[PDB]
Amino acid sequence: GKLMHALQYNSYGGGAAGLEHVQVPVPTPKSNEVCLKLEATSLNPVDWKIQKGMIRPFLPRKFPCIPATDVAGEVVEVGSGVKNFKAGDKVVAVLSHLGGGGLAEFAVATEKLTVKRPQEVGAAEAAALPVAGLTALQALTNPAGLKLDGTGKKANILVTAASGGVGHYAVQLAKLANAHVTATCGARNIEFVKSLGADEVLDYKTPEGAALKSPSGKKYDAVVHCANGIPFSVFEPNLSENGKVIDITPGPNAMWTYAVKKITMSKKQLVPLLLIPKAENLEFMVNLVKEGKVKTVIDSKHPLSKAEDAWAKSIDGHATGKIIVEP
Numbered sequence: 001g002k003l004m005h006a007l008q009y010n011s012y013g014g015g016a017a018g019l020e021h022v023q024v025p026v027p028t029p030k031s032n033e034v035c036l037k038l039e040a041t042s043l044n045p046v047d048w049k050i051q052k053g054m055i056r057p058f059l060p061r062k063f064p065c066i067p068a069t070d071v072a073g074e075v076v077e078v079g080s081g082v083k084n085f086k087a088g089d090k091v092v093a094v095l096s097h098l099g100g101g102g103l104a105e106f107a108v109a110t111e112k113l114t115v116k117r118p119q120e121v122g123a124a125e126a127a128a129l130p131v132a133g134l135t136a137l138q139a140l141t142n143p144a145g146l147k148l149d150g151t152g153k154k155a156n157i158l159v160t161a162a163s164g165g166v167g168h169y170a171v172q173l174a175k176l177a178n179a180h181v182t183a184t185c186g187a188r189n190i191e192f193v194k195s196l197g198a199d200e201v202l203d204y205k206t207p208e209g210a211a212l213k214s215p216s217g218k219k220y221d222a223v224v225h226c227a228n229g230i231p232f233s234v235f236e237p238n239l240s241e242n243g244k245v246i247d248i249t250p251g252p253n254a255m256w257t258y259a260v261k262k263i264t265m266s267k268k269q270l271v272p273l274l275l276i277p278k279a280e281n282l283e284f285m286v287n288l289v290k291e292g293k294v295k296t297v298i299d300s301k302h303p304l305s306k307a308e309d310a311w312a313k314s315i316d317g318h319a320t321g322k323i324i325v326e327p
């Protein structure tokens, strides 16, 4: 019965204050799970949303909850039925949102959602990938219908909040797909988003950025919508005839909009997106980082002993790239 350091919250609404440092049993791998000694964990906005109560009645399943799901680490123990990993292997993995366990010294992941991390890729650089990166990949690959080898159709992509976790992957992945990328962000990251490969960058505080209006007049074929303030009517004049707004933060309004735009057979569509994590895709993204085709941008690094600072930074929402917790 080894013990570990972890952070957990015990109730809704506590913010970073409600995040409490605790000493808890190291989890035991089931027959299909692996136990990782964590080398890096990355936060996602859904992590603090769950704690706030915004994902009720789905999450969290039970209190207390150890938050975060994107991890990179070293395998220390594998389950009786695990074939692809042994102790000592460096990996990157996605933890179940049901059980969490990223802000801890150790975590268990299923074999299905664990991928070998090549030595060319650091732990933090890899831990930033699972949620943010796979979401960008899914949005551009399914609804936007792009191909990242070069077969794909030419296209105009808008990426809102291009400076955040999903956004900053989306911009880079979109360029690998030979698309014209228009991006929105704050004034301080304009040069940053340009360096990711965006053809046009808008400051969303300016009138033109708020209208999402392309400085060269482009109509968008698909929007990877990573921000939150914007009603469909703002997107509509900027969409091509059959353009899709891919809302990666679907709420009740999005769902309803989706419904009536299906019902009324609208040519311009709003499409909710719910990430489906698959190892093939994680393996694919990790490989892109290895080959230097995609770079992970890290907002900040925090030790586990001060992880409430990383949490606060997530909550605040001004992250540029991915927030990382290290041991």
Ligand SMILES: NC(=O)c1ccc[n+]([C@@H]2O[C@H](COP(=O)([O-])OP(=O)(O)OC[C@H]3O[C@@H](n4cnc5c(N)ncnc54)[C@H](OP(=O)(O)O)[C@@H]3O)[C@@H](O)[C@H]2O)c1
Pocket (backbone or CB within 6 Å): 044, 045, 046, 131, 132, 135, 160, 161, 162, 163, 164, 165, 166, 167, 184, 185, 186, 187, 189, 204, 226, 227, 228, 229, 248, 249, 250, 273, 274, 275, 314, 317, 318, 319, 320, 321
């Ligand atoms: N459905 C799913 O499966 C799924 C998966 C992943 C994420 N999400 C959701 O998608 C959202 C974004 O995720 P994320 O990790 O990429 O967020 P994030 O990294 O935490 O957001 C940070 C960036 O967004 C920028 N931003 C905020 N408001 C903006 C606006 N109105 N216009 C342009 N930029 C803006 C911020 O810029 P400034 O500091 O300059 O203001 C900041 O740099 C979250 O709501 C998240 O829950 C959903």
